[PDB]
Amino acid sequence: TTGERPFSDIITSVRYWVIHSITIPALFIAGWLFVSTGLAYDVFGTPRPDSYYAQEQRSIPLVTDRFEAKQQVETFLEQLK
Amino acid sequence: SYPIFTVRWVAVHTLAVPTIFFLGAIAAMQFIQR
């Protein structure tokens, strides 16, 4: 052994489950809402199913300049009106 | 007799907390429609 309490002990203790029957679902719900609110989309810049193309466009918004790439993506985004 | 907030505790949780959050996210994603 190396001093820490056995996991066998912990995960079968009543207390552990009192704590984690709260904390585990809490987190889970938080991740859920992170998606369902749409927050994720905006945090990582990921296209919603209606934001990959404009209505009549079929050209991928490929980044083509290195240093003005940011303005390029911003333009690509404004292109969806 | 036993400590609670060991190095092991930390390691365990830096892995486990994000994992449950992430699984909640992916769960949610399963009901997204085009």
Partner: peptide, 30 residues
């Protein structure tokens, strides 16, 4: 941004909760 408070409210409620439940043993340890 309301979505960050809505989403990361469960996490901070879990943290506050477990802090409440483990506080005496944590104080005893520290």
């Amino acid at each position: 941004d309301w979505r960050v408070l809505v989403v990361l409210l469960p996490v901070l409620l879990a943290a506050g909760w477990a802090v409440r439940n483990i506080l005496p043993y944590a104080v005893k340890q520290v």
